[PDB]
């Protein structure tokens with residue numbers, strides 16, 4: 066996998082590397098499609114002012130157990146150049162289909178494709194969320210992502226989803242509370258309690274915040290799904306219909322908190338038994354009541370259930 070034009074190359078671990086083109090813009094850096102030896106890889110390049118996000122992501126990837134089919138594969142990380150011109154790189158697998166966001170813009174999904182992407186995404190988030198003692202490399206902590214959105218879910222060639230971008234991720238050692246405000250993520254996906262600015266610095270509070278955002282990603286999937294053979298409109302961001310592409314904090318507060326509104330679950334989706342069950346699941350994920358939200362693992366099983374629905 067890779068063309069061979071014969072020009073100047075760089076090295077990574079003594080292996081030829083070349084940058085191809087910018088593929089995406091992360092929150093903290095630029096994602097390049099690149100060629101390393103004979104494979105395509107993604108080189109995420111962080112400016113020096115985002116050194117802490119580079120460090121955070123490297124640290125997260127260095128935690129016990131952080132290798133999984135539904136977590137974007139880490140290849141390496143390196144502080145390069147000089148202390149006056151610092152190059153901060155993090156290299157991962159590259160996936161040609163890119164983000165679920167880009168995919169859904171250009172493509173629709175059948176019922177069974179939606180189920181595959183949904184289940185795999187859910188399993189990746191559940192694994193990220195899971196506290197896992199007894200690994201050969203140590204004790205994996207529960208990890209909150211803190212910016213779950215369709216831009217941060219990548220699709221492999223057969224539409225298997227994986228979770229990407231751990232620049233904001235925060236691990237939790239235990240279940241005890243520690244006192245916070247937490248508007249670090251993407252505004253349109255922020256849960257009501259986040260938009261109000263008043264949250265519990267506790268593991269479950271942070272996991273429930275991710276689960277609200279994942280409910281919105283599942284709505285995105287439903288919005289572009291051909292199940293039951295109805296009309297499918299052009300891809301829209303969650304809340305774009307209600308408050309546009311660049312909402313203020315105030316707009317989000319009005320729609321999400323005061324009006325308790327969510328993206329529309331279309332009436333004709335209730336006629337397909339699988340979609341109806343998806344709709345129920347999404348509703349539990351985005352509940353105003355954080356304690357009412359489903360866990361990532363629960364969602365995994367709902368999807369398996371609905372995929373096997375009869």
Ligand SMILES: Cn1c2c(c3ccc(Cl)c(Cl)c31)CCNC2=O
Pocket residue numbers: 088089090091092096107109137157158159160161162163164216217219229230231
């Ligand atoms: C590794 N990666 C990231 C993004 C990507 C988009 C497309 C592809 Cl192919 C890859 Cl590998 C991406 C978006 C923001 N953050 C990432 O960490």
